[PDB]
Symmetry: D2
Subunit: 215 residues, 4 copies
Amino acid sequence: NLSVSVYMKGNVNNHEFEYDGIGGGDPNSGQFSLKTKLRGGKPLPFSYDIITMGFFRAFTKYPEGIADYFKGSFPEAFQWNRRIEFEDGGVINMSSDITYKDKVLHGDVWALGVNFPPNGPVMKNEIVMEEPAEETLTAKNGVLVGFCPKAYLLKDGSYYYGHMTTFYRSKKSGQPLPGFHFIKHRLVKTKVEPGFKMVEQAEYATAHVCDLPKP
Amino acid sequence: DNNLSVSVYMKGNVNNHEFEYDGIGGGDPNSGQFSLKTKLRGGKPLPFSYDIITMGFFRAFTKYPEGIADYFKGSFPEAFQWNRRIEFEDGGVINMSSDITYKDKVLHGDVWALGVNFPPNGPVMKNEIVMEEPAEETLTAKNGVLVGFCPKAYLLKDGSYYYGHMTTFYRSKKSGQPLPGFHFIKHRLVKTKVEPGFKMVEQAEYATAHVCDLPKP
Amino acid sequence: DNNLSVSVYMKGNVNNHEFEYDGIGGGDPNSGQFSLKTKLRGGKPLPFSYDIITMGFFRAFTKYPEGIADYFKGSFPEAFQWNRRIEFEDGGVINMSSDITYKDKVLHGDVWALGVNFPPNGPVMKNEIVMEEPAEETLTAKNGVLVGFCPKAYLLKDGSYYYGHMTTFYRSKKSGQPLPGFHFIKHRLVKTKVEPGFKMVEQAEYATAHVCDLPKP
Amino acid sequence: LDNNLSVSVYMKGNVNNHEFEYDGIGGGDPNSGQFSLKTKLRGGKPLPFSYDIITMGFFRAFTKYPEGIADYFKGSFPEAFQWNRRIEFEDGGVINMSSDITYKDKVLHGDVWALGVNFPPNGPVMKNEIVMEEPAEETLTAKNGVLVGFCPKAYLLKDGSYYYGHMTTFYRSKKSGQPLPGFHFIKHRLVKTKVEPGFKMVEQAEYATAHVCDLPKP
């Protein structure tokens, strides 16, 4: 078991907010859950679904055949920096500095969302959930880069999409980068209080290579 | 049938380099495995990486499990088109479109490729791509068409990677055909034989549709 | 010369709709003003907004002041190519490329247009654009070509705007021609006549190169 | 709307996981569209990336507007505006910035966030290879009650080559009911007039003038 805490300070379309989160799970299982709580006295004035991934690739089931960059980074752990570029021009950048101290994995997270159409599903809180996703990961320019199409189910039954790019960088000196692989993800908000003042979310994630035969 | 013949014609223009390919092959559309041999028209070598047009050379060839509706096989006898962009890390973009028809006993693809803004010293124009990695395509209905998103990772001759984001619109020519539910297609495309200058290429693609096999809370 | 005739042929495919235009016109390349008339081949209307292909239909027609190197006129008699993308706000992307030649007294563009991923309910496929606004193109030499970046604003019937980002690579076919310094081109393109279905269009472009007139340098 | 407006600015930023904070002081003439700022990096460590990508973080109130173009920014006063912004660079780096601008006493204050991500570690930003940004033309158009500006950015590198980005900014007045302006452009020239090692201190000036198209019509 690995205890997790997280703090996010964010600004999305000039709306400032902060969350604290607590949770954890078995990092080897690739399954963990967090409860986040909004600081302050304002409901969150946009879709929380665009910040769910701000709230630890240490929680990924890695099979023996794939180098686990994230667990390999410990005790120094990693950072990441990330953008999700959405179909309507909105972009959220997020960054996290993850530390493992006092037997807790902590994420110190920034989120900065810009250029969301005021009438778009993000600012109008029209996202129901994000679909499961496949992240494609490759070493490049000395960091690990993941690309992940994101599909968000909207209240009207349609989809809103984004492309996520993440740079993951170990803080362990000279840690080898892993080989090309994928991570399959399912993130679900299992509990949501009005205005996203409290959210419980779970992420399941498993690393894998291609199942398909050769040629 | 478990046996489907394929023909393809591609005309293309990448950074103002015009080219044409003819392709012939086939495979098992139900198994999601097929191969094609392509032949470059004219006497000259391809002046850019063929790897960026491999996907121009048939989603009919996808293993679909019974849990997921097969839009592509469902489109037949009218078949489909698709239109597509790959946006590369260095600003190069290749657009491709195909009109797929089924006639006599052959699935034909009539393909356009138009690649622009590739850095002249970039891996595409300098022909520095070795191969493309397997890929996961995420597919969803969007504004009445099926849209696939697929990160593309290209291994370079220097051992590094070059990436692109692919977006494809798939549209059945069978009017009113329902779109499938959200799903994924896993792909592995390999150039199994390459003649110098990409004057001839043999390529195979394996593709299987799947949903998420992760448990749910 | 103060009068230069133009001929253009465009073959295009936008969301799998194929079309061809022929255009003729001309103007004063030194004044940066010219107009052409395009005519759609065949009897069917254009199934999308012609406004996204207007720029397919000659940077030779740019007023260049003495202190800015004129890459386009400088390329003559060999002339230039260009390759171009417009990435629109809703994910539609049109690529275009042109090979420009000069065979005496006429300056001739052979153009490809390939537009993909336009939402079927978007302003392009629904023909909702009424005009494009004037534009500023920022140009810099990059990796041996001239690169222009130009925000595009399209006015819609409903009074709102539809946006795109245009990137163009311009490459002289005159061997060893130096690239110009950083500069801008201001543009105004207007469709002065439009027949139903865009079967015929008259369009004019005014273009003038400039540097920054603000103080400091 | 007087010919001298003092400005203060605070920016907190995080670019490729490098955190920093700047305080800035200056001002200028909002009507001539010219002002300058002195920024000071908090702490003793140098800025680990090119300051040039955050220059625009450090007030569209300072724009020369001719009579025929509505001045959304000065029109927002005393409530002022916000803005939120991205610059998408050629190599995939993206910096988002946002500012809340307030007018209290004389001073115009900007409270700025900067969050830069996905900059290639050996790219010109992280390797501090940018010399300057070129002058720019910003195309502005109202959409959805927001003024959107698009601005190609060209950064000159130490080797004489260019590094480019596309800037998109949303500007939103905090004056309720304020009309949006018509389509127009703003020409900009931003110069770092002074730079101390590690970008510990920078003086920068911006000149900006709104204009429409002066080309003939058919």
